[PDB]
Amino acid sequence: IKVFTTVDNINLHTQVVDMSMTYGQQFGPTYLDGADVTKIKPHNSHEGKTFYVLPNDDTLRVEAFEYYHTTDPSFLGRYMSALNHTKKWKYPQVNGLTSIKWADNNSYLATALLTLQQIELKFNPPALQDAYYRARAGEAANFCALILAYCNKTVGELGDVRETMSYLFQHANLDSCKRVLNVVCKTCGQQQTTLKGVEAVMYMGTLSYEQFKKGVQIPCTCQATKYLVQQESPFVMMSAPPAQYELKHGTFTCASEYTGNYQCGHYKHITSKETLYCIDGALLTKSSEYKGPITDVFYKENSYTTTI
Numbered sequence: 068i069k070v071f072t073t074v075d076n077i078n079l080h081t082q083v084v085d086m087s088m089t090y091g092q093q094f095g096p097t098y099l100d101g102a103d104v105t106k107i108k109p110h111n112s113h114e115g116k117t118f119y120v121l122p123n124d125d126t127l128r129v130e131a132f133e134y135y136h137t138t139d140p141s142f143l144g145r146y147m148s149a150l151n152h153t154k155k156w157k158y159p160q161v162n163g164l165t166s167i168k169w170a171d172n173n174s175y176l177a178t179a180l181l182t183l184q185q186i187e188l189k190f191n192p193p194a195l196q197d198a199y200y201r202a203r204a205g206e207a208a209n210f211c212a213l214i215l216a217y218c219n220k221t222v223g224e225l226g227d228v229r230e231t232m233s234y235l236f237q238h239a240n241l242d243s244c245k246r247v248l249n250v251v252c253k254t255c256g257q258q259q260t261t262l263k264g265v266e267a268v269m270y271m272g273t274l275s276y277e278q279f280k281k282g283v284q285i286p287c288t289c290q291a292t293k294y295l296v297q298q299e300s301p302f303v304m305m306s307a308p309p310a311q312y313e314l315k316h317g318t319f320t321c322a323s324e325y326t327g328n329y330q331c332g333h334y335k336h337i338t339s340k341e342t343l344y345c346i347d348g349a350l351l352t353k354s355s356e357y358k359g360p361i362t363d364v365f366y367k368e369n370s371y372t373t374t375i
């Protein structure tokens with residue numbers, strides 16, 4: 068039988084396999100829709116199908132770099148292992164967002180996936196960008212399997228939305244983003260650093276974008292005030308340890324609810340549309356008011372300068 072071997076599922080390579088030998092002896096580690104067939108001999112109904120293989124020549128290595136933006140040999144295999152599960156998850160439309168039916172601890176992925184459908188991101192690696200597009204359109208198995216691989220998580224492992232968003236933002240074009248903070252000490256006085264890229268969109272310490280513009284209470288080298296002078300991003304992520312927080316319809320984009328123990332707990336997603344919508348995977352609920360344990364709030368921005 069003839070088959071196609073790729074690394075990216077774009078450059079397909081016709082292959083004349085031997086039927087008596089395993090894939091493993093001929094190509095090296097070989098996969099089919101995420102399922103490892105390394106140790107299997109070719110069945111007949113495998114004829115002319117696409118198998119992913121671990122880059123075993125320079126052409127393939129270069130093609131893998133250009134599609135995934137990593138040369139880590141574990142990557143292809145971790146991706147394939149995730150996909151082998153994520154492809155059996157369900158991806159219902161809830162309030163015109165692709166969510167995930169709860170399975171294999173995916174609270175955090177659903178929340179990241181819903182959040183990503185509501186903010187402006189361009190992913191640098193083609194495999195992320197192509198899968199993201201496919202995901203907003205309702206088929207998201209690849210996109211979730213990729214998030215798992217890129218974040219060094221595996222199916223069932225407990226995940227933080229804020230770490231996940233953080234890892235993913237490092238594969239997105241934010242080069243053009245900018246945060247100017249000014250920090251004020253009673254004794255040291257004033258200093259302002261610029262931050263760029265990921266560090267420009269994410270702050271750990273309070274949920275309220277308002278409070279950040281009005282400044283917050285951080286330590287000094289000698290108890291100071293860090294305030295926000297200038298923001299140039301399409302959004303901001305404001306994060307803090309879970310605390311009872313009030314969400315007011317129209318003052319934020321969307322948010323992460325986190326209920327339970329450090330790590331063992333469960334993420335839900337609140338999005339501000341015409342009313343407040345709470346998406347718990349496949350389950351949807353709505354109310355005009357919301358008060359509950361929030362850990363991340365996303366906000367819309369273009370260009371803010373301070374009047375201070």
Ligand SMILES: Cc1c(N)cccc1C(=O)N[C@H](C)c1cccc2ccccc12
Binds near residue numbers: 327
């Ligand atoms: C940290 C983590 C990991 N590594 C994996 C899965 C979930 C969490 C978590 O508890 N995250 C929440 C949002 C969280 C993040 C940060 C501080 C927290 C303190 C108490 C309870 C929860 C806290």
Ligand SMILES: [Cl-]
Binds near residue numbers: 136137
């Ligand atoms: Cl890179």
Ligand SMILES: [Cl-]
Binds near residue numbers: 136192237239
């Ligand atoms: Cl990248």
Ligand SMILES: [Zn+2]
Binds near residue numbers: 078080126127130
């Ligand atoms: Zn090629």
Ligand SMILES: [Zn+2]
Binds near residue numbers: 136191192238
């Ligand atoms: Zn890259």
Ligand SMILES: [Zn+2]
Binds near residue numbers: 151155
């Ligand atoms: Zn599974």
Ligand SMILES: [Zn+2]
Binds near residue numbers: 252256287288
């Ligand atoms: Zn000081």
